[PDB]
Amino acid sequence: TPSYSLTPAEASAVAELTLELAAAYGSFGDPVLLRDLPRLAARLPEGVQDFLREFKLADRHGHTVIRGHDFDQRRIGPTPDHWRGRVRPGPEFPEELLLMLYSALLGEPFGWATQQDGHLVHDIFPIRSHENDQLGMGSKQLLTWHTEDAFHPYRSDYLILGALRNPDHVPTTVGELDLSSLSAEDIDVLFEPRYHIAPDESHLPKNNTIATEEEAARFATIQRMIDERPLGPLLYGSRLDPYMRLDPYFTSVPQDDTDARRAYDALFKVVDSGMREVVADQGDVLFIDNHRAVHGRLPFQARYDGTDRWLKRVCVTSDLRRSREMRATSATRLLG
Amino acid sequence: TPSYSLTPAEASAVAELTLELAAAYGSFGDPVLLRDLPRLAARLPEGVQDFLREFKLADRHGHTVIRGHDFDQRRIGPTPDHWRGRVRPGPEFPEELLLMLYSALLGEPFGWATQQDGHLVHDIFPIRSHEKQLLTWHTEDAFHPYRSDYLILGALRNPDHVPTTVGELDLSSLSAEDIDVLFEPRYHIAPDESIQRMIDERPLGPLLYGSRLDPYMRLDPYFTSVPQDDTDARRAYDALFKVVDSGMREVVADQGDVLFIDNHRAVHGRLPFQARYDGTDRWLKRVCVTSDLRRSREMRATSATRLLG
Numbered sequence: 050t051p052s053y054s055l056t057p058a059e060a061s062a063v064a065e066l067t068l069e070l071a072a073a074y075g076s077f078g079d080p081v082l083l084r085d086l087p088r089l090a091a092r093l094p095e096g097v098q099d100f101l102r103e104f105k106l107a108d109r110h111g112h113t114v115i116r117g118h119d120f121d122q123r124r125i126g127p128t129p130d131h132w133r134g135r136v137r138p139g140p141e142f143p144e145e146l147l148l149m150l151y152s153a154l155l156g157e158p159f160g161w162a163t164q165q166d167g168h169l170v171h172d173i174f175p176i177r178s179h180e181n182d183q184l185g186m187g188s189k190q191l192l193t194w195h196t197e198d199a200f201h202p203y204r205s206d207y208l209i210l211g212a213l214r215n216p217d218h219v220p221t222t223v224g225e226l227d228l229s230s231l232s233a234e235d236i237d238v239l240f241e242p243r244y245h246i247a248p249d250e251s252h253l254p255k256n257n258t259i260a261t262e263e264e265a266a267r268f269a270t271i272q273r274m275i276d277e278r279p280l281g282p283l284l285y286g287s288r289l290d291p292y293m294r295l296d297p298y299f300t301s302v303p304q305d306d307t308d309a310r311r312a313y314d315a316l317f318k319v320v321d322s323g324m325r326e327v328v329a330d331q332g333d334v335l336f337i338d339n340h341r342a343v344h345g346r347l348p349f350q351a352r353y354d355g356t357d358r359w360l361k362r363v364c365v366t367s368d369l370r371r372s373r374e375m376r377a378t379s380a381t382r383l384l385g
Numbered sequence: 386t387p388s389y390s391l392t393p394a395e396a397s398a399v400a401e402l403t404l405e406l407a408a409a410y411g412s413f414g415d416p417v418l419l420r421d422l423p424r425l426a427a428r429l430p431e432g433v434q435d436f437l438r439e440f441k442l443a444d445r446h447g448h449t450v451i452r453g454h455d456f457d458q459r460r461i462g463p464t465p466d467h468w469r470g471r472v473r474p475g476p477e478f479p480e481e482l483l484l485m486l487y488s489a490l491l492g493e494p495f496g497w498a499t500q501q502d503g504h505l506v507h508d509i510f511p512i513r514s515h516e517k518q519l520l521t522w523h524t525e526d527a528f529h530p531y532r533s534d535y536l537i538l539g540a541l542r543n544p545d546h547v548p549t550t551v552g553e554l555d556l557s558s559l560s561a562e563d564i565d566v567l568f569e570p571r572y573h574i575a576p577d578e579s580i581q582r583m584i585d586e587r588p589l590g591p592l593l594y595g596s597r598l599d600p601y602m603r604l605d606p607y608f609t610s611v612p613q614d615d616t617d618a619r620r621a622y623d624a625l626f627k628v629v630d631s632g633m634r635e636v637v638a639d640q641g642d643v644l645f646i647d648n649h650r651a652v653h654g655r656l657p658f659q660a661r662y663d664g665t666d667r668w669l670k671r672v673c674v675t676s677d678l679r680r681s682r683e684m685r686a687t688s689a690t691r692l693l694g
């Protein structure tokens with residue numbers, strides 16, 4: 050798995066850029082900043098730019114890491130208790146800007162309207178009231194591995210995770226597909242529309258307002274997937290080096306299909322045993338290809354004292370316009 | 386329809402950059418050029434980049450034009466006889482690269498392995514060999530799921546000012562009943578004859594999609610037919626056709642203009658014109674833009690190739 054280690058000079062260059070940008074722009078509520086992101090990202094070190102571009106175009110590895118970022122701990126401050134009720138933007142705004150610049154190198158940053166007040170950069174840190182919960186804000190509970198939003202037609206193409214701090218070196222789990230570990234019959238079956246992938250509860254149209262024609266037409270495609278229950282493949286693209294969409298928790302193998310179940314069990318075993326622990330430490334930015342890797346997080350003991358693990362999260366789409374029907378306006382980047 | 390008129394300084398900067406790259410890189414057959422394209426596009430005048438980006442994200446207009454590029458006629462030379470067998474690149478390479486840069490600002494340049502020897506930049510000029518003309522407009526490759534998201538048309542020359550037809554969708558003329566029908570998968574779009582399968586079961590997809598208040602469209606009348614027993618669908622189809630046809634506009638891509646067309650918000654057609662067949666004839670270059678290079682992976686020979694088929 051190729052990575053890129055920043056020299057101090059590059060690290061210093063990136064840090065300097067993020068600071069200048071943070072001073073020059075007010076918040077992410079500025080549409081000019083979203084407009085300028087790709088051009089602004091051209092001012093990152095050249096080696097970084099070539100690296101990510103090579104990662105994007107190679108379409109081979111399902112993750113990569115850029116290590117060695119200078120994340121100024123004094124300026125960033127204490128890990129917050131909650132995301133709710135924070136001044137926007139925080140003093141860690143430069144790091145958020147960084148991840149947005151990276152996101153423009155891969156595609157477009159986008160979000161989910163119901164998630165963390167629609168912030169394009171998500172917070173991942175322990176919250177005490179979310180202790181017994183399986184998500185980013187958890188800690189005690191194991192975050193089993195998955196493709197992000199496996200059922201969803203407009204799911205992220207890439208995820209970007211930037212570790213502001215991770216004092217106890219808590220690893221993220223990521224797994225790829227070892228294609229030589231599967232029989233050619235199984236591959237053929239997994240390529241065929243023989244599986245049901247269930248929506249996550251947050252994507253359910255009964256969760257969101259049952260008001261007006263306006264909002265009904267916004268979930269009509271999901272509603273149809275729920276109603277009709279179309280069956281779909283779990284491997285796609287090239288038969289030789291395939292994309293996958295695997296979330297074990299929401300995948301249903303039809304009982305009568307003995308071939309589908311045999312192949313799924315083989316696909317599951319290969320991916321589970323292939324899982325790797327990747328530690329995103331302070332100043333690491335982990336890039337995950339959502340079509341080639343799955344990801345999870347191991348359980349850890351939080352302290353809720355402002356010294357806790359803190360990652361930032363940005364989701365990337367390679368085609369913002371493909372999801373227009375699920376977005377209120379053309380300008381808005383929030384599905385739902 | 387917003388446009389951008391380059392200052393002479395912008396025009397000179399673009400030209401210079403254009404020529405520097407034309408010496409630095411060998412051809413489009415250079416994988417490092419394709420790699421560097423978005424980085425290279427960042428060296429273009431900032432006001433140009435900002436303009437294009439506003440066009441992409443606004444998702445409001447079906448076309449736009451960047452006007453006033455300096456295209457050196459002496460260096461470009463004579464409009465050729467044919468594209469076939471012609472060695473690449475020619476001396477018009479600088480302008481081809483400009484369009485490639487613009488495509489990196491919008492997404493990713495791609496092409497078709499069958500069409501024009503599988504070149505990423507396409508030639509459009511009068512041919513004596515391929516010579517009552519009907520006036521037709523279409524969505525580009527309306528049938529194809531991996532069709533272009535944008536089209537870029539750079540006018541190297543157009544002495545007689547022969548326009549291009551471009552048409553958008555006015556909804557204020559269509560009833561909400563027709564819209565809802567055109568949104569439903571009740572229409573067949575015929576293919577085109579222009580380990581190789583892909584021949585998917587192309588059945589009945591919709592004509593309108595995206596926002597029901599501001600729809601995208603895939604409209605190619607010549608290859609569109611409704612099932613006979615679906616009378617509501619044929620009523621809605623006629624109403625859409627009448628709306629799109631009666632709204633059609635003529636937009637002249639003059640020498641120095643690069644015309645951008647949103648393949649989702651606009652249909653386009655060519656107008657018939659008398660050519661001189663010497664070497665002074667209207668000459669455009671076309672680059673096809675995908676927003677998602679990887680969505681079309683199943684129809685591409687390898688990972689690195691941008692050619693479908």
Ligand SMILES: [Fe+3]
Nearest residue numbers: 195196197198
């Ligand atoms: Fe997740």
Ligand SMILES: [Fe+3]
Nearest residue numbers: 523525526653
């Ligand atoms: Fe055409």
